[PDB]
Amino acid sequence: LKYVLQDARFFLIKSNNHENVSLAKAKGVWSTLPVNEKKLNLAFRSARSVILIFSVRESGKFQGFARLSSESHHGGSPIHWVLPAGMSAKMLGGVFKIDWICRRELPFTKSAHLTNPWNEHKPVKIGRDGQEIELECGTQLCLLFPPDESIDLYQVIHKM
Ligand SMILES: O=C(Nc1cccnc1)c1cc(C(=O)c2c(F)cccc2Br)c[nH]1
């Protein structure tokens, strides 16, 4: 696991509902507005691993974290995302393929000691959608998650 996390960049992904996360866990894909797509695509080219750490708002927990497998691609079968009020699929950028590293949950109470230096040292659970997490802080956060024996780490390693 630590090899997968080496020198990774971590991003806090705040979904407004559980459905979108369930979709992401079932289909291994993710999407977002173009401006955020551009940052993720640029970060994928330049970083050894791009880890998304998911947290559904109000849930009090992280729902897991996944690693970008590639830049975003267009022209796929439409996914039934639950989008913010007033957003349509036409406003979305492409779709990202993601390999889940851990699908198990982590409550905020087990991360109360981890503070994000890149967000005024507030607890890592606190942050806006997209807030980047400092390397060591993000690494420790991922290591607090329960082990998930259902994930094939070699499938993700071969893509690095
Ligand atoms: O990707 C997201 N945010 C970010 C910001 C900045 C950089 N990287 C990433 C993000 C997507 C969401 C969504 O609910 C969402 C989704 F699940 C699927 C499709 C579109 C949408 Br909209 C929340 N947050």
mmCIF file of C-alpha atoms and ligand atoms in Angstrom:
data_model
loop_
_atom_site.group_PDB
_atom_site.id
_atom_site.type_symbol
_atom_site.label_atom_id
_atom_site.label_comp_id
_atom_site.label_asym_id
_atom_site.label_seq_id
_atom_site.Cartn_x
_atom_site.Cartn_y
_atom_site.Cartn_z
ATOM 1 C CA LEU A 1 0.000 0.000 0.000
ATOM 2 C CA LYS A 2 2.777 2.420 0.929
ATOM 3 C CA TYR A 3 4.364 1.778 -2.471
ATOM 4 C CA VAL A 4 1.099 2.849 -4.112
ATOM 5 C CA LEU A 5 1.081 6.005 -1.958
ATOM 6 C CA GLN A 6 4.732 6.971 -2.532
ATOM 7 C CA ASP A 7 4.966 10.670 -3.455
ATOM 8 C CA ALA A 8 1.270 10.650 -4.304
ATOM 9 C CA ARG A 9 -0.848 13.776 -4.428
ATOM 10 C CA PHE A 10 -4.038 13.603 -2.367
ATOM 11 C CA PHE A 11 -7.304 15.421 -3.031
ATOM 12 C CA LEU A 12 -10.339 15.646 -0.765
ATOM 13 C CA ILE A 13 -13.441 14.819 -2.820
ATOM 14 C CA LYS A 14 -16.687 15.985 -1.202
ATOM 15 C CA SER A 15 -19.719 14.366 -2.824
ATOM 16 C CA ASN A 16 -23.144 15.794 -1.988
ATOM 17 C CA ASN A 17 -24.761 12.333 -1.897
ATOM 18 C CA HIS A 18 -23.963 8.649 -1.499
ATOM 19 C CA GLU A 19 -25.327 7.649 -4.919
ATOM 20 C CA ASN A 20 -22.424 9.196 -6.849
ATOM 21 C CA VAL A 21 -19.949 7.362 -4.616
ATOM 22 C CA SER A 22 -21.866 4.101 -5.077
ATOM 23 C CA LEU A 23 -21.777 4.678 -8.840
ATOM 24 C CA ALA A 24 -18.027 5.286 -8.590
ATOM 25 C CA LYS A 25 -17.537 2.111 -6.547
ATOM 26 C CA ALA A 26 -19.639 -0.003 -8.917
ATOM 27 C CA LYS A 27 -18.299 1.364 -12.225
ATOM 28 C CA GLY A 28 -14.795 2.470 -11.199
ATOM 29 C CA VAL A 29 -15.239 5.901 -12.797
ATOM 30 C CA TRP A 30 -15.451 9.529 -11.719
ATOM 31 C CA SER A 31 -16.267 12.882 -13.289
ATOM 32 C CA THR A 32 -16.417 16.576 -12.417
ATOM 33 C CA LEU A 33 -16.565 20.043 -13.969
ATOM 34 C CA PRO A 34 -14.010 20.890 -16.685
ATOM 35 C CA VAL A 35 -11.820 23.201 -14.578
ATOM 36 C CA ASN A 36 -11.346 20.448 -12.001
ATOM 37 C CA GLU A 37 -10.867 17.938 -14.828
ATOM 38 C CA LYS A 38 -7.982 20.042 -16.157
ATOM 39 C CA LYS A 39 -6.256 20.088 -12.759
ATOM 40 C CA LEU A 40 -6.700 16.333 -12.302
ATOM 41 C CA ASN A 41 -5.412 15.632 -15.824
ATOM 42 C CA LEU A 42 -2.407 17.903 -15.283
ATOM 43 C CA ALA A 43 -1.755 16.322 -11.882
ATOM 44 C CA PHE A 44 -1.979 12.838 -13.418
ATOM 45 C CA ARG A 45 0.716 13.654 -15.974
ATOM 46 C CA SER A 46 3.104 15.141 -13.403
ATOM 47 C CA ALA A 47 2.590 12.998 -10.275
ATOM 48 C CA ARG A 48 3.353 9.367 -9.492
ATOM 49 C CA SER A 49 -0.165 8.768 -8.122
ATOM 50 C CA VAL A 50 -3.326 10.880 -7.908
ATOM 51 C CA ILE A 51 -5.388 9.700 -4.924
ATOM 52 C CA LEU A 52 -8.984 10.840 -4.462
ATOM 53 C CA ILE A 53 -10.250 10.551 -0.872
ATOM 54 C CA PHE A 54 -14.047 10.568 -0.884
ATOM 55 C CA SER A 55 -16.240 12.066 1.843
ATOM 56 C CA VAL A 56 -20.003 12.448 1.430
ATOM 57 C CA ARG A 57 -21.107 15.694 3.065
ATOM 58 C CA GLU A 58 -22.912 15.286 6.414
ATOM 59 C CA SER A 59 -21.909 11.603 6.596
ATOM 60 C CA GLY A 60 -19.220 12.126 9.240
ATOM 61 C CA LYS A 61 -16.922 9.687 7.436
ATOM 62 C CA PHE A 62 -14.609 9.095 4.519
ATOM 63 C CA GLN A 63 -15.998 6.435 2.184
ATOM 64 C CA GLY A 64 -12.616 5.277 0.842
ATOM 65 C CA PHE A 65 -9.993 6.408 -1.625
ATOM 66 C CA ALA A 66 -9.118 5.543 -5.224
ATOM 67 C CA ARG A 67 -6.226 6.202 -7.603
ATOM 68 C CA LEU A 68 -6.607 7.796 -11.029
ATOM 69 C CA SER A 69 -5.802 5.217 -13.697
ATOM 70 C CA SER A 70 -5.706 7.656 -16.624
ATOM 71 C CA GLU A 71 -6.640 11.092 -17.852
ATOM 72 C CA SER A 72 -10.298 11.738 -18.591
ATOM 73 C CA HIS A 73 -11.844 10.294 -21.757
ATOM 74 C CA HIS A 74 -15.018 11.241 -23.615
ATOM 75 C CA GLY A 75 -17.512 9.198 -25.616
ATOM 76 C CA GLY A 76 -18.720 6.578 -23.150
ATOM 77 C CA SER A 77 -22.024 5.208 -21.933
ATOM 78 C CA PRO A 78 -23.683 7.994 -19.897
ATOM 79 C CA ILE A 79 -23.577 7.495 -16.128
ATOM 80 C CA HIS A 80 -26.582 8.523 -14.025
ATOM 81 C CA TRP A 81 -24.803 10.916 -11.695
ATOM 82 C CA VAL A 82 -26.822 12.787 -9.087
ATOM 83 C CA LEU A 83 -25.641 16.302 -9.941
ATOM 84 C CA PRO A 84 -25.885 19.504 -7.891
ATOM 85 C CA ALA A 85 -29.100 21.468 -8.346
ATOM 86 C CA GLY A 86 -28.874 23.371 -11.620
ATOM 87 C CA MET A 87 -26.027 21.308 -13.099
ATOM 88 C CA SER A 88 -26.583 19.174 -16.191
ATOM 89 C CA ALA A 89 -24.446 16.454 -17.741
ATOM 90 C CA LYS A 90 -23.658 18.851 -20.598
ATOM 91 C CA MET A 91 -21.659 20.926 -18.089
ATOM 92 C CA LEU A 92 -19.419 17.995 -17.124
ATOM 93 C CA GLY A 93 -15.934 17.337 -18.398
ATOM 94 C CA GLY A 94 -14.847 13.865 -19.397
ATOM 95 C CA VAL A 95 -14.915 10.680 -17.341
ATOM 96 C CA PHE A 96 -11.991 9.428 -15.257
ATOM 97 C CA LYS A 97 -11.119 5.785 -14.750
ATOM 98 C CA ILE A 98 -10.182 5.045 -11.139
ATOM 99 C CA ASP A 99 -8.876 1.957 -9.339
ATOM 100 C CA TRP A 100 -10.245 1.763 -5.821
ATOM 101 C CA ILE A 101 -7.492 1.158 -3.271
ATOM 102 C CA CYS A 102 -9.917 0.890 -0.356
ATOM 103 C CA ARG A 103 -13.722 0.759 -0.370
ATOM 104 C CA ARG A 104 -14.140 0.610 3.419
ATOM 105 C CA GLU A 105 -15.231 3.553 5.562
ATOM 106 C CA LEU A 106 -13.333 5.669 8.095
ATOM 107 C CA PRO A 107 -15.199 7.846 10.618
ATOM 108 C CA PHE A 108 -13.987 11.377 11.250
ATOM 109 C CA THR A 109 -13.338 10.504 14.902
ATOM 110 C CA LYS A 110 -10.445 8.234 13.868
ATOM 111 C CA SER A 111 -8.793 11.119 11.962
ATOM 112 C CA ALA A 112 -9.236 13.889 14.551
ATOM 113 C CA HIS A 113 -5.483 13.964 15.241
ATOM 114 C CA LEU A 114 -4.471 14.474 11.586
ATOM 115 C CA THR A 115 -4.273 18.139 10.564
ATOM 116 C CA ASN A 116 -3.766 19.312 6.983
ATOM 117 C CA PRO A 117 -0.884 21.830 6.808
ATOM 118 C CA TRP A 118 -2.132 22.998 3.399
ATOM 119 C CA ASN A 119 -5.505 24.034 4.868
ATOM 120 C CA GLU A 120 -4.481 26.279 7.788
ATOM 121 C CA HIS A 121 -3.735 23.170 9.884
ATOM 122 C CA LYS A 122 -7.426 22.384 10.362
ATOM 123 C CA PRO A 123 -8.353 18.709 10.841
ATOM 124 C CA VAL A 124 -8.013 16.821 7.575
ATOM 125 C CA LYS A 125 -11.751 16.074 7.562
ATOM 126 C CA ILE A 126 -12.289 19.822 7.062
ATOM 127 C CA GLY A 127 -11.897 21.244 3.583
ATOM 128 C CA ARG A 128 -13.661 22.401 0.458
ATOM 129 C CA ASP A 129 -14.308 20.124 -2.489
ATOM 130 C CA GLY A 130 -10.946 19.540 -4.142
ATOM 131 C CA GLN A 131 -8.790 20.632 -1.186
ATOM 132 C CA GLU A 132 -5.339 19.146 -1.701
ATOM 133 C CA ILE A 133 -3.867 17.281 1.275
ATOM 134 C CA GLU A 134 -0.195 17.487 2.210
ATOM 135 C CA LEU A 135 1.871 14.419 1.334
ATOM 136 C CA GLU A 136 2.552 13.007 4.801
ATOM 137 C CA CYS A 137 -0.838 14.010 6.218
ATOM 138 C CA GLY A 138 -2.612 12.374 3.286
ATOM 139 C CA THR A 139 -0.416 9.282 3.549
ATOM 140 C CA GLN A 140 -1.219 8.860 7.245
ATOM 141 C CA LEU A 141 -4.929 9.374 6.556
ATOM 142 C CA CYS A 142 -4.948 6.546 4.014
ATOM 143 C CA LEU A 143 -3.091 4.274 6.447
ATOM 144 C CA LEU A 144 -5.785 4.796 9.108
ATOM 145 C CA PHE A 145 -8.352 3.136 6.829
ATOM 146 C CA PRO A 146 -9.226 -0.495 7.544
ATOM 147 C CA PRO A 147 -7.485 -2.977 5.256
ATOM 148 C CA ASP A 148 -9.675 -3.982 2.306
ATOM 149 C CA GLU A 149 -8.803 -7.540 1.276
ATOM 150 C CA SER A 150 -11.038 -7.349 -1.825
ATOM 151 C CA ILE A 151 -8.690 -5.080 -3.830
ATOM 152 C CA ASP A 152 -6.019 -6.408 -6.203
ATOM 153 C CA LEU A 153 -3.103 -4.035 -5.647
ATOM 154 C CA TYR A 154 -1.066 -5.618 -8.454
ATOM 155 C CA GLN A 155 -3.739 -4.533 -10.944
ATOM 156 C CA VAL A 156 -3.076 -0.941 -9.845
ATOM 157 C CA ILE A 157 0.701 -1.332 -9.573
ATOM 158 C CA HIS A 158 1.041 -2.440 -13.197
ATOM 159 C CA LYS A 159 -0.341 0.947 -14.304
ATOM 160 C CA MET A 160 2.387 2.982 -12.555
HETATM 161 O O1 LIG B 1 -14.238 15.862 -8.610
HETATM 162 C C1 LIG B 1 -14.771 16.557 -7.813
HETATM 163 N N1 LIG B 1 -14.110 17.699 -7.215
HETATM 164 C C2 LIG B 1 -12.757 18.103 -7.531
HETATM 165 C C3 LIG B 1 -12.443 19.444 -7.417
HETATM 166 C C4 LIG B 1 -11.159 19.858 -7.715
HETATM 167 C C5 LIG B 1 -10.234 18.912 -8.115
HETATM 168 N N2 LIG B 1 -10.565 17.636 -8.213
HETATM 169 C C6 LIG B 1 -11.783 17.206 -7.936
HETATM 170 C C7 LIG B 1 -16.206 16.297 -7.373
HETATM 171 C C8 LIG B 1 -17.188 15.682 -8.120
HETATM 172 C C9 LIG B 1 -18.330 15.681 -7.338
HETATM 173 C C10 LIG B 1 -19.676 15.099 -7.737
HETATM 174 O O2 LIG B 1 -20.574 15.065 -6.970
HETATM 175 C C11 LIG B 1 -19.811 14.555 -9.153
HETATM 176 C C12 LIG B 1 -19.737 13.196 -9.347
HETATM 177 F F1 LIG B 1 -19.575 12.379 -8.278
HETATM 178 C C13 LIG B 1 -19.838 12.665 -10.615
HETATM 179 C C14 LIG B 1 -20.011 13.498 -11.703
HETATM 180 C C15 LIG B 1 -20.078 14.866 -11.516
HETATM 181 C C16 LIG B 1 -19.972 15.391 -10.241
HETATM 182 BR BR1 LIG B 1 -20.066 17.307 -9.993
HETATM 183 C C17 LIG B 1 -17.996 16.305 -6.151
HETATM 184 N N3 LIG B 1 -16.729 16.658 -6.213
#
